[PDB]
Amino acid sequence: LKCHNTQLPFIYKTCPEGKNLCFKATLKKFPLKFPVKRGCADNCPKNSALLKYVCCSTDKCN
User: Fold this and answer.
1) CATH code (residue 3)
2) Is 51 helix (H, G, I), strand (E, B) or coil?
3) Distance CA 24, CA 7 (A)
4) Which residue segment(s) compose the domain that 54 sits in?
5) CA-CA distance, 18 to 40, in Å (whole number)?
6) Are 18 and 8 contacting, i.e. CB atoms less than 8 angstroms apart?
7) N or C terminus: fewer CB in 10 A for the chain?
8) 18, 42 in Cβ contact below 8 A?
9) Contact (Cβ atoms closer than 8 angstroms) between residue 41 and residue 19
10) To 10 degrees, the CA torsion angle through 61, 38, 52, 19?
11) DSSP E strands: which ranges in 1-62?
12) Among 25, 24, 34, which residue's Cα sits nearest to residue 52?
């Protein structure tokens, strides 16, 4: 399963071992904001003190 992390350009990669899923997160930076990170996934993250995470199943699903 191949997905996304950089996205700036959609130019992607395949996941690694232990990474059947896909997540992404974002920051409570700006009233509006500019997300955080992404990649593949496994469990389903521990959103933060100041963030959010979400995690899909399918390709580039995050």
Assistant:
1) 2.10.60.10
2) strand
3) 11
4) 1-62
5) 9
6) no
7) N
8) yes
9) yes
10) 70
11) 2-3, 13-14, 21-27, 37-41, 51-56
12) 25
